[PDB]
Design a protein around this motif. Structure first.
Motif, PDB file in Angstrom:
ATOM      1  N   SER C  38       0.808  -1.213   0.000  1.00  0.00           N
ATOM      2  CA  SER C  38       0.000   0.000   0.000  1.00  0.00           C
ATOM      3  C   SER C  38       0.845   1.267   0.000  1.00  0.00           C
ATOM      4  O   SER C  38       0.319   2.345  -0.295  1.00  0.00           O
ATOM      5  N   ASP C  39       2.133   1.171   0.319  1.00  0.00           N
ATOM      6  CA  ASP C  39       3.008   2.340   0.279  1.00  0.00           C
ATOM      7  C   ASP C  39       3.403   2.599  -1.167  1.00  0.00           C
ATOM      8  O   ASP C  39       4.350   2.001  -1.684  1.00  0.00           O
ATOM      9  N   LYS C  40       2.676   3.499  -1.823  1.00  0.00           N
ATOM     10  CA  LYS C  40       3.072   3.993  -3.131  1.00  0.00           C
ATOM     11  C   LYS C  40       4.219   4.996  -3.047  1.00  0.00           C
ATOM     12  O   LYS C  40       4.569   5.592  -4.067  1.00  0.00           O
ATOM     13  N   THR C  41       4.794   5.203  -1.865  1.00  0.00           N
ATOM     14  CA  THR C  41       5.854   6.185  -1.650  1.00  0.00           C
ATOM     15  C   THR C  41       7.219   5.525  -1.768  1.00  0.00           C
ATOM     16  O   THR C  41       8.048   5.652  -0.876  1.00  0.00           O
ATOM     17  N   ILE C  42       7.464   4.787  -2.848  1.00  0.00           N
ATOM     18  CA  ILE C  42       8.668   3.968  -2.937  1.00  0.00           C
ATOM     19  C   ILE C  42       9.914   4.824  -2.757  1.00  0.00           C
ATOM     20  O   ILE C  42      10.186   5.743  -3.542  1.00  0.00           O
ATOM     21  N   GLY C  43      10.690   4.503  -1.727  1.00  0.00           N
ATOM     22  CA  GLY C  43      11.920   5.199  -1.436  1.00  0.00           C
ATOM     23  C   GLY C  43      11.820   6.315  -0.422  1.00  0.00           C
ATOM     24  O   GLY C  43      12.859   6.855  -0.026  1.00  0.00           O
ATOM     25  N   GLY C  44      10.624   6.675   0.022  1.00  0.00           N
ATOM     26  CA  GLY C  44      10.506   7.762   0.974  1.00  0.00           C
ATOM     27  C   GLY C  44       9.063   8.108   1.252  1.00  0.00           C
ATOM     28  O   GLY C  44       8.161   7.296   1.045  1.00  0.00           O
ATOM     29  N   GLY C  45       8.857   9.326   1.740  1.00  0.00           N
ATOM     30  CA  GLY C  45       7.531   9.810   2.079  1.00  0.00           C
ATOM     31  C   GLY C  45       7.520  10.468   3.443  1.00  0.00           C
ATOM     32  O   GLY C  45       8.332  10.157   4.318  1.00  0.00           O
ATOM     33  N   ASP C  46       6.588  11.400   3.626  1.00  0.00           N
ATOM     34  CA  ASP C  46       6.374  12.059   4.906  1.00  0.00           C
ATOM     35  C   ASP C  46       5.196  11.470   5.670  1.00  0.00           C
ATOM     36  O   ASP C  46       4.733  12.080   6.638  1.00  0.00           O
ATOM     37  N   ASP C  47       4.701  10.306   5.255  1.00  0.00           N
ATOM     38  CA  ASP C  47       3.524   9.718   5.881  1.00  0.00           C
ATOM     39  C   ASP C  47       3.724   9.567   7.385  1.00  0.00           C
ATOM     40  O   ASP C  47       4.848   9.461   7.881  1.00  0.00           O
ATOM     41  N   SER C  48       2.607   9.557   8.115  1.00  0.00           N
ATOM     42  CA  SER C  48       2.682   9.440   9.567  1.00  0.00           C
ATOM     43  C   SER C  48       3.320   8.118   9.985  1.00  0.00           C
ATOM     44  O   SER C  48       4.074   8.073  10.965  1.00  0.00           O
ATOM     45  N   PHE C  49       3.030   7.028   9.259  1.00  0.00           N
ATOM     46  CA  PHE C  49       3.635   5.737   9.591  1.00  0.00           C
ATOM     47  C   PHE C  49       5.153   5.775   9.439  1.00  0.00           C
ATOM     48  O   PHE C  49       5.846   4.953  10.051  1.00  0.00           O
ATOM     49  N   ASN C  50       5.690   6.721   8.662  1.00  0.00           N
ATOM     50  CA  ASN C  50       7.138   6.869   8.561  1.00  0.00           C
ATOM     51  C   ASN C  50       7.764   7.371   9.855  1.00  0.00           C
ATOM     52  O   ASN C  50       8.993   7.380   9.966  1.00  0.00           O
ATOM     53  N   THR C  51       6.954   7.803  10.824  1.00  0.00           N
ATOM     54  CA  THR C  51       7.490   8.176  12.127  1.00  0.00           C
ATOM     55  C   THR C  51       8.141   6.994  12.831  1.00  0.00           C
ATOM     56  O   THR C  51       9.014   7.195  13.685  1.00  0.00           O
ATOM     57  N   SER C  54      11.571   3.635   8.505  1.00  0.00           N
ATOM     58  CA  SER C  54      12.305   4.275   7.422  1.00  0.00           C
ATOM     59  C   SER C  54      12.126   3.449   6.152  1.00  0.00           C
ATOM     60  O   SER C  54      11.848   2.249   6.204  1.00  0.00           O
ATOM     61  N   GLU C  55      12.288   4.101   5.004  1.00  0.00           N
ATOM     62  CA  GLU C  55      12.083   3.461   3.711  1.00  0.00           C
ATOM     63  C   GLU C  55      13.408   3.338   2.974  1.00  0.00           C
ATOM     64  O   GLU C  55      14.190   4.294   2.926  1.00  0.00           O
ATOM     65  N   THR C  56      13.657   2.161   2.408  1.00  0.00           N
ATOM     66  CA  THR C  56      14.828   1.935   1.578  1.00  0.00           C
ATOM     67  C   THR C  56      14.479   2.165   0.111  1.00  0.00           C
ATOM     68  O   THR C  56      13.313   2.303  -0.265  1.00  0.00           O
TER      69      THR C  56
HETATM   70 CA   LIG Z   1       5.209   6.451   2.809  1.00  0.00          CA
END
Ligand SMILES: [Ca+2]
Ligand SMILES: O=C(Cc1ccc(-c2ccc(OCCN3CCN(C(=O)CC4CC4)CC3)cc2)cn1)NCc1ccccc1
Ligand SMILES: Nc1nc2c(ncn2[C@@H]2O[C@H](COP(=O)(O)OP(=O)(O)OP(=O)(O)O)[C@@H](O)[C@H]2O)c(=O)[nH]1
Ligand SMILES: Nc1nc2c(ncn2[C@@H]2O[C@H](COP(=O)(O)OP(=O)(O)O)[C@@H](O)[C@H]2O)c(=O)[nH]1
Ligand SMILES: [Ca+2]
Ligand SMILES: [Ca+2]
Ligand SMILES: [Ca+2]
Ligand SMILES: [Mg+2]
Ligand SMILES: [Mg+2]
Ligand SMILES: [Mg+2]
Lengths: 313, 62, 438, 424
Positions: C38-51, C54-56
């Motif tokens: 469901s994370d279409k933010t491949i490689g990053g993002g400021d989403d709350s779950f990113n608190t 971390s994304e590779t």
């Molecule tokens: Ca994200």
């Protein structure tokens, strides 16, 4: 078998209770500070309620209700009666009382009012620290009281004195009634069917008082007095049940209460006070303590008529 | 009993309900205490090993 | 987005963290391999779950977590477990031999020789943070590691990250569940030396969780897995505001602000409902009013005390599932009209409420049943001081004979620390009393 | 977490051989060192007492020590003779003559370095050694004197490792020589200084159990060593099998020893064997706390329990176990100190021993252990007041002063136990 401790050697009632418990052959009295106990006959000041019910695999009972001092201390009792909606702003059975959040102005106002009405102004000053006789000060002049009130250490309460009490007339005698009430872990309210009036030791049991009412006033203890007594006991104890109930707690509580009433000439019962560590009449220790063992202790720690009126609710 | 500061969103909402209103040590000091504990340990161990040395003196003597 | 770092110390901390990250992955739809479809933010993002993750570059969601123990079997199980590839090796730090339930061994003797490594591995995570909120520290009061090394790490995280909140999740010792007898010592010591470094601490009494599992899950012999999954249910309900869209408790600072007016009294009582066995054939699902009412039965509290005898300083109700504000307000009215809830005269008598519509997530094959609504209540009540009293009393009973003290002194400690910490505890106890009774 | 085992002297080697037989059976290792068991629960914690050898043979981490070759001849010939590493048989040729001085000061000193070499070469191959266990008697010369000397040397070389002992106390009812109280008295002082835990196995209790309870009219040393090996297996159960807690020797000692010098434990076992009846949990607990089931000849009701650990073994209901334990405590609670909260702990191992479907091992740190030391002391004094037999020791370099010191240290130890028996 079951184990118990006694942290108050001065308790005559629970002294008898522990004696009989031991005599049953199924109870072991531990040393004061042993934590592995089933029942605590606790102290009267700073009972460590916070350390109960955290003992693996032990059902722990204690002979006191945390928070019951709100009813057993005249300042706290006055606050509870005035504030709690369960009890009317002025319920019909408690004297006009003022604890001196400070109500000096209000008691001064009402006492001036009764001053000008010229038909009742006798009050009474007392504290929850009356030294078994010392501390009481009845006064027609309430300026006397207030002045010395401030000439006293701890807090005091000013009640309206019973100007026209009932008199045991073969002697023109004033008296008060003592009723004993047991509240068990389920919060059943059991009234002890035998009270006393404060004849030998200035002590009259209910049979004599009942016969006196029958012969002289053509009435009975039950109808004239005891219905009101039961009503007041039920009101007081039901008012605080949510605050003190141990129905869903890690430890359980039962407690014996002593309710002091007095009666005016119109056969109206008033509540004087509630005593949380009452003594008992000499002749009835054996019966009442056995009843306590049956209803409050063996009810929780079972072995292998009733002396109590169950004040249902 | 008043409800207050209501914020909503696609994944919930939040608010407040009111029923009545009202009426450090530096690193140097961490280090200079860990090291004090360590030196106390070292003194205890030194006394132990000196007691042992005493017993070996005694064994040779015997 | 404002990142948070989780630090699990000792056996209790590591295993509870295993539970928490399992539950977090289930709630965020992250697989054991770290992929989040469901994370279409491949490689990053400021989403709350990113608190918390971390994304590779390859779409791996890696916890901002650090696991540390002085012996490795507990973390070896992590390294060889279902979520082995969730984590990368440097997050898992272990020693050779442990603190043997000795606060001195974990704080002074062995702690000194792993602290720099742990702080380096923590800095390596803080460097991956555009802005760091602070840390969520999980540990036990009883173990030698979880007390001694935790207090050391907190003391010096205060120095290295002095403008960053630190929240504790502490397991309070229970004789029924424990192998040790000296835990009053470790608890008193660690609390004394850590109090000035913890902004908000959520204590969990193993006794309360044990009896909850026994009564409401019908488990006569709860395992650490049962208690830990329940504990993560509570922990997740606490941290959802940080991991999810919302307006309440979105900042670690906000936890203190809403729950801790007095820094010393920073131990909020947690209550949670409902806990329902998955073996129950069918269950009459409970209402907003029934669960909010349950939040006031001591049998649901994480610590067994009586809030009736004591005063509240703050209250948060955190609902997950089918909940609407008006039902909550109705329930609050009903309960106030029927329960003893007294606040201090200098704090509003109110409730801060938060609602995630997403119902509670429960581990498949676990002992907890699905429920369409649940609530966790965080209330800073002075009644929790009972837990201190008990502990202090136990301390006093042993230290009066200096029982077991030589084990600590032998590692460099002095009896002066024992008595200093105990006097700090006495000060805290009547600090609670002063705020608490009349 | 590796453990290094050392057995010194006749009694030490005999008891150690029996212990290795028992635990090798439990772990499925055959006399050749080959595993032929039927569960991986047998192997998960097998590195604690066994090294993995070429061909993945398992070799006990055991060092065998004697000042004469007899008992080690028998051991190397006995049931599990060929499993012990040949280099780890370290012996002299003369003997110690049941003389503490010869084992500690003269004959032993000539061999202690040789023993420490093997100890070191075993410790080097340890990923993380947690400590040592020693089996020996206190009434002879080799076990007694040389083992205490070895303990001192090991503490010197490994000052921060746990040293525990299974120490057989002498008793006149089963006695080899009259100088046993002397040797014992001199050894006990050493232990008081240099062991983290000493499990006091009293031959008086072993004989009385084998006679009065197992109904064996003429007990041999084998019949007592059967009980001793059973207890040793029980004590070490929590470290050898995987289902249990996470505690090394140091953690268990930390929680069982409230004071440094008072680390002498009373072992206990139930049921007592030498039957097919399934023994119940209530009976297990009752027998386990019964004095007639204990290896130290002391009455636990004449003292108070500082700490208690019980290891049940077999398939049983932990609820029933834990109810019965709470029974036996809350019932007889005047024999547990009130200043050590929650000092009774219980572990249950899902694997049973062999021959028995349910067993309980009792480890009690009781102040009643006095009664043993006063016994020995009395015997000691009864001879020392006439200098009797002292010529055996003075001839090897010892002074009366040393005997007086050993007498005083043990009378002190008795007094320390009295101090913590009266405390409230
Ligand atoms: Ca994200
Ligand atoms: O000390 C030795 C022998 C020895 C001494 C003491 C102990 C000991 C035993 C039990 C115990 O507590 C265990 C209780 N818990 C078990 C888990 N519980 C749960 O509820 C699980 C929880 C819900 C999820 C209940 C509580 C502590 C200590 C054990 N063994 N050493 C061996 C040795 C001696 C000499 C030489 C060499 C080796
Ligand atoms: N809830 C819960 N508590 C645990 C768990 N593991 C250990 N504990 C508690 O922690 C206490 C002892 O500390 P541990 O966590 O076992 O060990 P530690 O803190 O890491 O210290 P060391 O043993 O030296 O590593 C016990 O009283 C347990 O109640 C767990 O998995 N879940
Ligand atoms: N339990 C047990 N005790 C023994 C055995 N052999 C000797 N003892 C006791 O230990 C003492 C003799 O010690 P010994 O084994 O000869 O050791 P050494 O004298 O140092 O070689 C005697 O007082 C006996 O009571 C045995 O096989 N089993
Ligand atoms: Ca800080
Ligand atoms: Ca020679
Ligand atoms: Ca050499
Ligand atoms: Mg009264
Ligand atoms: Mg650990
Ligand atoms: Mg011999």
């Amino acid at each position: 078998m079951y184990t118990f401790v006694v942290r108050d050697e001065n308790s005559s009632v629970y002294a008898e209770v522990s004696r009989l418990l031991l005599a049953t052959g199924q109870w072991k009295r531990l040393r004061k500070d042993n934590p592995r106990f089933n029942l605590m006959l606790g102290e009267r000041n700073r009972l460590p309620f916070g350390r109960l019910g955290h003992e693996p695999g032990l059902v722990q009972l204690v002979n006191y209700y945390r928070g019951a001092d709100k009813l057993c201390r005249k300042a706290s009792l006055v606050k509870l009666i005035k504030t709690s909606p369960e009890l009317s702003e002025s319920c019909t059975w408690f004297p006009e009382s003022y604890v001196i959040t400070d109500e000096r102005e209000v008691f001064l106002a009402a006492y001036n009012r009764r001053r000008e009405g010229r038909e009742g102004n006798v009050w009474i000053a007392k504290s929850s620290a009356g030294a078994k006789g010392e501390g009481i000060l009845i006064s027609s002049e309430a300026s006397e009281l207030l002045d010395f009130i401030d000439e006293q250490g701890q807090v005091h309460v000013i009640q309206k004195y019973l100007e026209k009490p009932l008199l045991l007339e073969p002697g023109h005698r004033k008296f008060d009634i003592r009723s004993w009430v047991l509240v068990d872990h389920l919060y059943n309210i059991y009234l002890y069917r035998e009270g006393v009036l404060r004849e030998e030791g200035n002590e009259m049991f209910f049979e004599e008082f009942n016969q006196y009412l029958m012969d002289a006033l053509n009435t009975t203890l039950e109808n004239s007095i005891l219905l009101q007594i039961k009503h007041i006991i039920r009101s007081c104890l039901m008012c605080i049940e949510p605050a003190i109930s141990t129905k869903h707690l890690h430890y359980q509580s039962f407690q014996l209460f002593g309710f002091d009433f007095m009666v005016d000439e119109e056969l109206k019962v008033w509540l004087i006070e509630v005593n949380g560590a009452p003594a008992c009449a000499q002749k009835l220790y054996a019966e009442l303590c056995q009843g306590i063992v049956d209803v409050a202790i063996s009810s929780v720690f079972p072995l292998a008529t009733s002396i109590f009126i169950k004040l249902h609710h | 009993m008043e409800v207050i500061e209501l914020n909503k969103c696609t994944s919930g909402q939040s608010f407040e309900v009111i029923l009545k209103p009202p009426s450090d040590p530096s690193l140097e000091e961490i280090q200079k205490k860990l090291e004090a504990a360590e030196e106390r340990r070292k003194y205890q161990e030194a006394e132990l090993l000196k007691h042992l040395a005493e017993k070996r003196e005694h064994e040779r003597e015997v | 987005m404002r990142e948070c770092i989780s630090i699990h110390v000792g056996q209790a901390g590591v295993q509870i963290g295993n539970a928490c990250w399992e539950l977090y992955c289930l709630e965020h739809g992250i697989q054991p391999d770290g992929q989040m479809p469901s994370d279409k933010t491949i490689g990053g993002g400021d989403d709350s779950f990113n608190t918390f993750f971390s994304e590779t570059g390859a779409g791996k969601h890696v916890p901002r977590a650090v696991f540390v123990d002085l012996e490795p079997t507990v973390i070896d199980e992590v390294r060889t477990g279902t979520y082995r590839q969730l984590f990368h090796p440097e997050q898992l730090i272990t020693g050779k031999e442990d603190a043997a339930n000795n606060y001195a061994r974990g704080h002074y003797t062995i702690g000194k020789e792993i602290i720099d490594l742990v702080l380096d591995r923590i800095r390596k995570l803080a460097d991956q943070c555009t802005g760091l909120q602070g840390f969520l520290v999980f540990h036990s009061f009883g173990g030698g590691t979880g007390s001694g090394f935790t207090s050391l790490l907190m003391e010096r995280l205060s120095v290295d990250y002095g403008k960053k909140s630190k929240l504790e999740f502490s397991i309070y010792p229970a004789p029924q569940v424990s192998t040790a007898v000296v835990e009053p010592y470790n608890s008193i010591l660690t609390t004394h030396t850590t109090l000035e470094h913890s902004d908000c601490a959520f204590m969990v009494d193993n006794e309360a969780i044990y009896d909850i599992c026994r009564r409401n899950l019908d488990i006569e012999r709860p395992t650490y897995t049962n208690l830990n999954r329940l504990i993560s249910q509570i922990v997740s309900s606490i941290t959802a505001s940080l991991r999810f869209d919302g307006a309440l408790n979105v900042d670690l600072t906000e936890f203190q602000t809403n729950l801790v007016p007095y820094p010393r009294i920073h131990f909020p009582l947690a209550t949670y409902a409902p806990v329902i066995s998955a073996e129950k054939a069918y269950h009459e699902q409970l209402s907003v009013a029934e669960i909010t009412n349950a939040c006031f039965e001591p049998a649901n509290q994480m610590v067994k005390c009586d809030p009736r005898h004591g005063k509240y300083m703050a209250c948060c109700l955190l609902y997950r599932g089918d909940v609407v504000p008006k039902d909550v307000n109705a329930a609050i009215a009903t309960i106030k009209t029927k329960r003893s809830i007294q606040f201090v005269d200098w704090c509003p008598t109110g409730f801060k409420v938060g609602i995630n519509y997403q119902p509670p997530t429960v581990v498949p094959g676990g002992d907890l049943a699905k429920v369409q609504r649940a609530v966790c209540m965080l209330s800073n009540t002075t009644a929790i001081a009972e837990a201190w009293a008990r502990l202090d009393h136990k301390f006093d009973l042993m230290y009066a004979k200096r029982a077991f003290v030589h084990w600590y002194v032998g590692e460099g400690m002095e009896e002066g620390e024992f008595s200093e910490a105990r006097e700090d505890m006495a000060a805290l106890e009547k600090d609670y009393e002063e705020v608490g009774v009349d | 977490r590796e453990i290094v085992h050392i057995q010194a002297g006749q009694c030490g080697n005999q008891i150690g051989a029996k212990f290795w037989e028992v635990i090798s059976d439990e772990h499925g290792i055959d006399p050749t060192g080959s595993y032929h068991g039927d569960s991986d629960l047998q192997l998960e914690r097998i590195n604690v007492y066994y090294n993995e050898a070429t061909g993945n043979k398992y070799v006990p981490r055991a060092i065998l020590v004697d000042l004469e070759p007899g008992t080690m001849d028998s051991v190397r010939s006995g049931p599990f003779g060929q499993i012990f590493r040949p280099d780890n048989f370290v012996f002299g040729q003369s003997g110690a003559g049941n003389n503490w001085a010869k084992g500690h000061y003269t004959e032993g000193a000539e061999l202690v370095d040789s023993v420490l070499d093997v100890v070191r070469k075993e410790s080097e191959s340890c990923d993380c050694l947690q400590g040592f266990q020693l089996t020996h008697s206190l009434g002879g010369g080799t076990g007694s004197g040389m083992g205490t000397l070895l303990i001192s040397k090991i503490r010197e070389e490994y000052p921060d490792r746990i040293m525990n002992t299974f120490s057989v106390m002498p008793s006149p009812k089963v006695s080899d020589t009259v100088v046993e109280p002397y040797n014992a008295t001199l050894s006990v002082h050493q232990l008081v200084e240099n062991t983290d835990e000493t499990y006091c196995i009293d031959n008086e209790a072993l004989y009385d159990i084998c006679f009065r309870t197992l109904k064996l009219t003429t007990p041999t040393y084998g019949d007592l060593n059967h009980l001793v090996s059973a207890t040793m297996s029980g004590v070490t159960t929590c470290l050898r099998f995987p289902g249990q807690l996470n505690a090394d020797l140091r953690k268990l000692a930390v929680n069982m020893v409230p004071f440094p010098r008072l680390h002498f434990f009373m072992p206990g076992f139930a049921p007592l064997t030498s039957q097919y009846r399934a023994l119940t949990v209530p009976e297990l607990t009752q027998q386990m706390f019964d004095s007639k089931n204990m290896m130290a000849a002391c009455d636990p009701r004449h003292g108070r329990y500082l700490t208690v650990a019980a290891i049940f073994r077999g398939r049983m209901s932990m609820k029933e176990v834990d109810e019965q334990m709470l029974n036996v405590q809350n019932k007889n609670s005047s024999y547990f100190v009130e200043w050590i909260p929650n000092n009774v702990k219980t572990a249950v191992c899902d694997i049973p021993p062999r021959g028995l479907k349910m067993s309980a091992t009792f480890i009690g740190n009781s102040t009643a252990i006095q009664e043993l030391f006063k016994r020995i002391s009395e015997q000691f004094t009864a001879m020392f007041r006439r200098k009797a037999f002292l010529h055996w020791y003075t001839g090897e370099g010892m002074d009366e002063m040393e005997f007086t010191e050993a007498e005083s240290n043990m009378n002190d130890l008795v007094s320390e136990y009295q101090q913590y028996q009266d405390a409230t």
